[model samples]
Target: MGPAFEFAVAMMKRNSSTVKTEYGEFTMLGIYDRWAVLPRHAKPGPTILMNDQEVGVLDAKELVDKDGANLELTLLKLNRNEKFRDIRGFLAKEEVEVNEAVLAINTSKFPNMYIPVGQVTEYGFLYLGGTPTKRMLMYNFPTRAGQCGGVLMSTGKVLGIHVGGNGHQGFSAALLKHYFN
Candidate 1:
């Protein structure tokens, strides 16, 4: 919400009744480029809102998966019939090296934090010793409940989406390329 961030942060609310019975509200980070990338399990209602404006979603099968059962993320198209604010950032389509700067944008957390993009130390036991692709990212950035799904950025470039406060962790935006293939 500060000058350091302007990557189109998103908030979600589920409606049970046809009109306005609140179900559950969720906060997430999104990158817009004619499409919006999001979490698979967020379960946003039929009517989606972004930056306080109504947006569109791909039907059911179109959502992307995170490759594991523990947590999953998805990709969607942020379409509208008229004008809207899509002046966010671009998705990072490369590998994360040892040192890079990043910041996380969360709806609930004002003044999104800046962080150095770094990889988490790995032990086979911690990751179950199998999948060679460790798409998960580690940053010592501040995380808490309702803070996950925030957009991880580097100078207005979308790098990743925060995983939640479970650990200083998140899913790399580079993996966003995996869904289309």
Candidate 2:
């Protein structure tokens, strides 16, 4: 059996209804879980990151459409394998798509933008008190350890990175279903 995972239920507000990408048209949603550990005296904001690189910031309270009610979270492997062996190895095997870039959004500030050179998001979470805590991530698919990224929602920004492919449906089917209270 795989190791147990955790799930964090949050209330999200749609920021950007949807965006058209090379892949397809995807809508953006900003999730806000009441319980977050934000840093002391740190202002809430949004910023995009790709492989430790900064991309851009997001707009504040953008007012997105909240159409999709039942959304399933996922954890995806980035350019590296489960072991985070480095992008070069993933490129060598040609197992991942390098052309696609990774985009992360931090809703703390405005002008949230996309990141580059990232794929297959591995994890996700909201800041509680002041630390980025592990929330729900890609649980339906098999992922490797150490290599993961995630979609982030804060204040009013939506960010997607290191994530690909459609995830499973229904909360009960998630690996972390038991953790919900």
Candidate 3:
């Protein structure tokens, strides 16, 4: 946590959104061109800041390669044009090694929160409520329940959206571009 930690904070500030539906308040990751990204849940729903005082929902879409495969991501078609980000980012043919430090760029304790740093312990599949499990980068951070859908970053590039975890392990969303397309 040196210069590596500094830049992720900058990236985190603009990449987070509070998505509120009847179910709960979720920290959906921001994607470029007016889309909020998260892992698809079993319950069908909408995603956006549920207030006219701010930007609201536009349309909602689901991203899955097949009926029950590649079930690691979801999209909330949003109304705003700024602060959204490109889903194309993530580890590109680059080496994301084990034992490397990472962060779940979360807002659960942000604006008055301490650093949420964790190391890449391993990479494996996380069951995201589908036929096929999604590959997720596992970290040793205290991945609390409220931090799902927060962006995960290593070095500076986005790794993926956070899915779930506890004090033992936290799972990043599948780091695949085609899944988002």
Candidate 4:
């Protein structure tokens, strides 16, 4: 089962909420737009350190439209976590089997739309850049309330990261500008 969280909305809005996991707690904020600009210090930074050694940060973004469709935002490396493994593996050696299950189950149950990880491009972030542009990924992750988070995954090295899901559809500059940064 998934974690329990809250998702708030105003007119023309769609986003996720903070989720608690056994490993850590992250927020998932989605926007109905194509671009989102955010800061390097998006609330809690995504840098990890061990033995006083800096590991890395989790900075990434997703490009979307009005109907919550992903375009391109691949830049950073994916963060490796257990949730992604569990969600995509369940217990099978083959992750595709698990991914297929999620897609099938969610789509059948929801009947609206649902996409798995492989279909989209995932990235990592060092920090959010300066300036206020409506098409920045960092800003998009942060909602009117705060930063939104979600699960991130990739196939190559099995790296994963918590990311922001864009709650938009297709080529919709209007939705992009209005819903997110």
Candidate 5:
């Protein structure tokens, strides 16, 4: 197999979990901070199914509620709860360098195995006025079957959440740090 395909095969070996929500089934980047970092569009219901077990209800409203005046402080308070300590290890603290290559594991099909896909092209993003608030990474990968909510990795480290294709857009490590850290 070619290097890219080989790498893809290797990445597929990493740990992954399936997240079943009311909207539909999606893949998660493993459990982090006592919660799986799902795609922004994944609407979770009373309880979400992870790895066949029904996990507690995920309050997406509470997590995404930016109404508070101080966003950082609000997130810190939410993350400090004792229950969430177990999942703190999955959060990515450092920033990913621009143009860095990464790999993503596709888990759209719960039990079916999907090969990991790598973005061959260099990475780029729109900072939306040079701030991290609305950053959108530009990835050049053709849309493939079962790609959403996959874990994006770089050098064996989680980098981003695989949102979708057609210039794939997902949450960056920095973006995740805002809430998880």
Candidate 6:
């Protein structure tokens, strides 16, 4: 594999985790904040499992809507018990550099591989369903099913959580920082 792909693998190995719910398994973005992020569509289970341990499903917050479809982001509260003391920390910064190249994992593949996706676009509100609202950093990549909520990384730092596709969208670091803080 190329160096970029290798780095992506390392990142997933160290920082990413699978989100298990009744519906199925999806990718969860591990963050520095005490919470993990998942796609709004994942349907948070009564209990979320990460690394073979149970994680608390705090709540799902709706951030945007597209054609009557609510794009939500679920926050999984980490258990403060001994089971999760060694997990790595996510990037805590509140902003991501414009055009920053990021790596995203394709969880649909066994032994996931990283795609050197495009960079972050200008910070602005994405218009969905004909209404201009919700500020976020859009991406040039094409996101597919099962990739939502995937972690976006750059320069060894967590940039944002992949929210949706069609023309990709991410819950910017600034927004996450504000919410988590």
Off by over 4 Å in 3: 42-47, 50-56, 65-67, 81-98, 105-117, 128-132
Better of 2 and 5 by TM-score: 5
Candidate 3 local Cα displacement, residue 111, angstroms = 4.1
Per-model TM-score versus the true fold: 0.55, 0.20, 0.72, 0.21, 0.58, 0.67
lDDT of each: 0.40, 0.24, 0.56, 0.24, 0.46, 0.56
Each candidate structure's count of clashing pairs: 0, 40, 2, 29, 2, 0
Per-residue CA lDDT of candidate 4, range 93-163, in tens? 21111121101101112222222422322121222223122221221221222122222222211112223
The 10-residue segment with the lowest total lDDT in model 4:
3-12
Q: Write one digit per residue (lDDT tens) for candidate 6, span 1-181.
A: 2454555577777567776677666777665545666765677765776655776665555554445443345656665452332223444444565445555654544336565666675464554435454545666665555556666666545666665655454443223454454
Estimate candidate 3's alpha-carbon lDDT, on a 0 to 1 scale. 0.56
In model 6, how many backbone clashes occur?
0
Report residue 181 deviation for candidate 4 (angstroms). Answer: 32
Superposed model 6: Cα runs more than 4 Å off: 1-7, 32-34, 51-71, 83-93, 98-100, 106-110, 128-133, 167-175
lDDT of 3 by residue, 23-101 (tens): 5555566666765676655122543443212455666666554545454666776666565666466544432544455
Model 1, span 1-181: residue lDDT tens: 2322333222112100011102333334433343455544455566575545555565423332255433234555445554223433244354343244454443433443444544332111123123232345555555455444455544434555554433444444332443432
lDDT of 2 by residue, 83-123 (tens): 22111211111112222223332332213333332222334
| TM-score result, candidate 4 | 0.21
Distance from true position, residue 143, model 6, in Å? 3.9
Model 4 score (lDDT): 0.24
Which prediction has more favorable TM-score, 5 or 6? Answer: 6
* Index of the highest-TM-score prediction: 3
Cα deviation at 57, candidate 2, in Å, is 23
Better of 1 and 5 by TM-score: 5
Instruction: Give the Å shift of residue 77 in candidate 4.
Output: 18
